[PDB]
Amino acid sequence: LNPSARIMTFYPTMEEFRNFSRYIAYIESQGAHRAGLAKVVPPKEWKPRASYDDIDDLVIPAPIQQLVTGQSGLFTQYNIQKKAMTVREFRKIANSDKYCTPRYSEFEELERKYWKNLTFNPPIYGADVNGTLYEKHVDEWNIGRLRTILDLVEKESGITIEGVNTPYLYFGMWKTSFAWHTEDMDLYSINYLHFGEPKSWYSVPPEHGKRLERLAKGFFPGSAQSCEAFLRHKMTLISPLMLKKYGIPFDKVTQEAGEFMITFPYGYHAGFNHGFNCAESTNFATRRWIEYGKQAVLCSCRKDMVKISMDVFVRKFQPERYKLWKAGKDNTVIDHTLPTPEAAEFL
Ligand SMILES: O=C(O)c1ccc(O)c2ncccc12
Ligand code: NI
Ligand SMILES: [Zn+2]
C-alpha cells in the first residue's frame, strides 16, 4: 500500500495511541515500513514530562567530538572522546557563537550548509547517554517499557544491551551526525525528540538496502574488505546528491520536538541535528523482525558488537522451523513489503 515507499506521517488519537505494539501493526498495514522510516505525531494532550528545567545537572559521561573527513559527498567520521560534562555546560557550548546554527531561510539552505561545512569546526555530541526523560507514570509509548517481544531477551537470559533494550539519550548541537546504518540485529527503533532544534533524517527503503550496500562497498573498498558489515561501525556518511547520482532511492524528513520517528528492520538511515536538542531512543521488535534477526549480517571485525541469540525467538514463534534452522537449512527469503502478522486485524 506504499508503492512509492515514501515516508509516511501518522497522527494517532489518544485511543489509537495507547497500545504501542498494536499501532505499529496498524502503520505497517498502511505500508509505512516500506520507506524504512515513519513519523508519528502524538495526541496534542500527550506529554512524557512536565518540565525540562531540571536536567541542567545531568551528566554526559562521554561526549564525542565528531571529526569528519572526505570530499564529494563521501565521508568517514572519527570519534574523539572528551571529558564528561553536564547538560548545562554542553548547552553553553552548543549555543556559543562558534557551534551554533547558521542563519537561514528554508531547510534546503541549512541542508546545503551542512554538506558544505561538514568536515570543519568539529562539534560535540552528547551521545549514548544511559537514561530516560519520561515520567515514571507515562503509559503511552514509554521508551523505557514498550512491552514488545524484544522483552524476551532480558526475560529469558537477564541480558541487557545499552541503548537496545534500554534507552539512550542524545544531546545534539548543530552539525552533529548519525552515519548510514540499519539497527543492531536489524531491529526497529523508536526516537523521541524531547525538545530543541529539529533533527533531519534520510532513509533508503529496505527493498533497496542491498543497492546502498553495493554502492558503499565500491566507495570504501578497504573497509568492505576488512569487515562484512562495515556500515555498522557508523562512520560512513553519504550525501543525498551522491545517492541521487548513483540511483539509490531515498527520502527525507525533518523531525521536530515532540514527534516520534520509527525505524524499520533493515531500513538504512542517517541524519544530523539542527542545533541544541535532546532525543531518546531504544530498539524493539515485532514478529516480522524475527526473520530479519536470523539473517542479519553482523560486524565481523570488532569485539564490542551486539549479537542477540535468535534461538529463543525461533522456538517460541517458528517451532516448525527450529530444527531445520539449527541444521543451517532454513532458506526463507524475506519479502520486505509484507506487514507484520499482528496487522491482520487491520486487513
Ligand atoms: O544520534 C542520532 O540522532 C541517531 C538517530 C538515529 C539512529 O538510528 C541512531 N543510531 C545510533 C546513534 C545515533 C542515532
Ligand atoms: Ni540507530
Ligand atoms: Zn566491523
Author numbering: 8 to 354
Text of the article:
Histone lysine demethylases antagonize the action of histone methyltransferases in a site- and methylation state-specific manner. The jumonji-C (JmjC) domain-containing enzymes constitute the largest class of histone demethylases, and the family is predicted to include about 30 human members. These enzymes utilize Fe(II) in a 2-oxoglutarate-dependent dioxygenase mechanism to remove methyl groups from methylated lysines of histone tails. JmjC-domain demethylases are linked with diseases, including androgen-dependent prostate cancer, obesity, and X-linked metal retardation, suggesting that these enzymes may constitute novel targets for therapeutic intervention.
We were able to crystallize 5-carboxy-8HQ in complex withJMJD2A to investigate the inhibitor interactions within the active site environment. X-ray crystallography was used to rationalize the mode of action of this novel demethylase-directed scaffold: 5-carboxy-8HQ occupies the 2OG binding site, and kinetic data indicate that it may indirectly affect the binding of the peptide substrate. Although it is unclear whether the observed shift in metal position occurs in solution with Fe(II) complexed at the active site, it highlights the possibility that inhibition of 2OG oxygenases by metal-chelation at their active sites may involve movement of the metal. Our findings, and those of others, demonstrate that 8HQ may provide an attractive generic template for generating inhibitors of 2OG oxygenases, and that inhibitory selectivity can be achieved through substitutions to the 8HQ core. The 200 µM 5-carboxy-8HQ treatment inhibition of JMJD2A was greater than treatment with 1 mM PDCA dimethyl ester or 2.5 mM DMOG indicating that 5-carboxy-8HQ is the most potent cellular JMJD2A inhibitor identified to date. Notably, this compound does not require modification to a “pro-drug” ester form in order to be active in cells, as do the previously reported N-oxalylglycine derivatives.
